[PDB]
Design a protein around this ligand. Sequence first.
Ligand SMILES: [Mg+2]
Ligand SMILES: [Mg+2]
Ligand SMILES: [Mg+2]
Ligand SMILES: [Mg+2]
Lengths: 114, 117, 45, 54
Amino acid sequence: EFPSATAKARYVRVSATKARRVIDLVRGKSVEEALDILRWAPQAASEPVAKVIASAAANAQNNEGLDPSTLVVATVYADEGPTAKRIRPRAQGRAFRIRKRTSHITVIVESRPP
Amino acid sequence: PKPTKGPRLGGSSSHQSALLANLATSLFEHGRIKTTEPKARALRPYAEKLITHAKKGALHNRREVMKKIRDKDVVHTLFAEIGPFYADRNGGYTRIIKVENRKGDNAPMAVIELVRE
Amino acid sequence: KGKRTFQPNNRRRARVHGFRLRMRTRAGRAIVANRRSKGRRALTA
Amino acid sequence: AVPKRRMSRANTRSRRAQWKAEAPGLVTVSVAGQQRKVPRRLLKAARLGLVDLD
RNA sequence: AAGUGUUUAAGGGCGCAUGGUGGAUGCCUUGGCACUGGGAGCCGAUGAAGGACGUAGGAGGCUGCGAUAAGCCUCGGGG
RNA sequence: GGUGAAAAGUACCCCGGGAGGGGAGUGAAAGAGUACCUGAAACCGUGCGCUUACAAUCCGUCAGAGCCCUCGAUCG
RNA sequence: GAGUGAGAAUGCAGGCAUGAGUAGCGAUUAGGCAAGUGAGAACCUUGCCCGCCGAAAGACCAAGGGUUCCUGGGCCAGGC
RNA sequence: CAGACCACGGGAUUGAUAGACCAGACCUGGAAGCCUAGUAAUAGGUGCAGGGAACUGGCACUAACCGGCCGAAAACUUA
Ligand SMILES: [Mg+2]
Ligand SMILES: [Mg+2]
Ligand SMILES: [Mg+2]
Ligand SMILES: [Mg+2]
């Protein structure tokens, strides 16, 4: 048992915290339910997660022959990536710093036929 | 036509009336409108009152309809085509449905239609 | 409402910090030579 | 009003865990023969087809 | 009826396995600093030092060059 | 400042518009993929064993039952 | 033979937490509907409505920037 | 009429919960048209007329949907 397939997406333009917020809603669920959820969610940050899950499913189906009907999200990291720094003027000449954060999504889907 | 009971839909006052008028015009012209949830809710009673005025339309009602709608062709079609089409329905001519929200601003989107039966 | 104390201009710029005015006087020539020795791209305005 | 001291890791995470989202309820709907999940709010629109299904 | 009695983690803490950000540590340089022995120590109206412009068949820089414009003529080296 | 001895810089297939990723290849190494020698500290995640929702702790120390992993012959 | 041992000099260089996923997203006018491009559209293109300036929030020049001017292509980076 | 969000209260086809329609109470003042007197503004009959949102009673005409998730017992001693 324990057949798994991984899928990564690096340099995503989404904050790590906002990505984990949506991940927590799908961590440890079937692939069908995961694709069903994250499509009607109001947060406009579930599209990368859904794309990564779909890519993982396609890879597991085209490289391991695993039936997509028995796939479940086994692990997900959604780590933080590089952060581009920039400046932003203010009231009295002071220069504030704005951080353009990113994210590195990582998922591992396995088969758990009950 | 009940007061909104709170902050109006379109910015400050004097704009919600024009917004509702334009929405009722588009509805009576096309047969179905897709707007924001609260906008459709505020339009429902407005459109129903306009439809009741059209139904009762014999004289002095065209004036009441024109003091709120400006499109002469829209008024003419609402008076002729619709006309007695709702002469049997004792109210409730506008059906409201909710659809998925749009990108950017997560505004609940609704759709209004004219019952045909 | 201040003018920010810049007031861009080409004629006055060249007349007050131009090569001719810098070469007229001795101190200006010395400054030009110092800038050339330092290697500045634009010696004068 | 300014922060006097540095909030501890626990004091920060205990409240950061509250900034979460609530998943919406789903409903099975038969459209074009295939079954798909759509919230009960858009259930009615799913029948008429006013809800695009990617 | 009285008494005893393990059983929950919205989240945090502790130690470990896995990882991202991060560019220090370790190993090197086409570079930089200080001196040894020599050459030569002024360049110019027969237009100096330094710059604008242009030059390869091609969008910009470095360098050479000056409408004879990454080159022209003569004389030696190597191939 | 430094990929790698040599670009030999992943043909081709799959998700997608790409970014990027998974197989299939080169390279000894891809825990060397033009974000590239070695890759620490603070920060951020995930999983694992204990802990806590009657509790007023410069946030440690000395005692100390239970739980967890392991070396020997149920104890030391 | 030391440029040889940092925990501080409101010490300097590079990265990251707290404040917080909070404020703010920069006036005195206000957007709405239909069709279309596009995988992705309230913010892109066409049509119909409502609103603002109209001694201008219109047009032409002086100073100033110098190819932002027009056509085809692109949405990493910049539009708060 | 409960309320920043939350939460509270009523309903969900076995229903008047809300929107629409009818009627009532109430507010406003005599609506558009016709005709009449006045060259004229203007007034008079159609007219307690026309218009209106919160208050009230009927009316399923429209929306509460062929709909989704949590959610119930170690054990032992004495009387
Ligand atoms: Mg020292
Ligand atoms: Mg230190
Ligand atoms: Mg606060
Ligand atoms: Mg872009």
